[PDB]
Amino acid sequence: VSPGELRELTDEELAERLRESKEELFNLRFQMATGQLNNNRRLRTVRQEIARIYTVLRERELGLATGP
RNA sequence: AAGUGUCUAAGGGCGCAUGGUGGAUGCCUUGGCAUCGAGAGCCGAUGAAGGACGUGGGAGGCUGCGAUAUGCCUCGG
Ligand SMILES: [Mg+2]
Ligand SMILES: [Mg+2]
Ligand SMILES: [Mg+2]
Ligand SMILES: [Mg+2]
Ligand SMILES: [Mg+2]
Ligand SMILES: [Mg+2]
User: Does this UniProt record's set of keywords contain Ribonucleoprotein?
Assistant: First the structure.
């Protein structure tokens, strides 16, 4: 996901997509452990996306770029 | 019969030849030392200096970072 395209998410579906990012990092972690995923770049990407969501969520309630 | 009369190397010495060991010498250098000219002269309870433990697809160290973890966002190049 991109910082710009995760701006149209207003206030709660942004947290809900943070939740599914956490869930998919979970499952991708599990397939790392069991060796059943081929592209291991995916958890780097997902971790970065979780960081992106957390960052944007922090800016919105610190007082920057808020809006639905 | 009397007599003179070489030669031998178990090993060793000396000199060569040919190797080994070793890391001197020479020539270097992502390291130092001494300065000069400019800067900046403080950091910390808004938690410092410095660390521990973690963090990467692969084990460890360094280095970076802090569960947002070799990373997140924005503005520039
Ligand atoms: Mg030398
Ligand atoms: Mg002062
Ligand atoms: Mg390494
Ligand atoms: Mg390492
Ligand atoms: Mg946190
Ligand atoms: Mg840019």
Answer: yes
Which nucleotide's C1' sits nearest to the alpha carbon of A52? Answer: B72
Q: Work out the burial of residue A58: count CB atoms within 10 Å of its CB; fewer than 13 is exposed, 13-18 middle, 19 or more buried.
A: exposed
Whether the CB-CB separation of A21 and A46 falls below 8 Å is answered with yes
The answer for residues whose C-beta is within 8 angstroms of residue A29's C-beta and 6 or more apart is: A43
Method: cryo-EM
Q: How many angstroms is it from A28 CA to the middle of ligand 4?
A: 23
Rounded CA-CA distance A52/A45 in Å is: 10
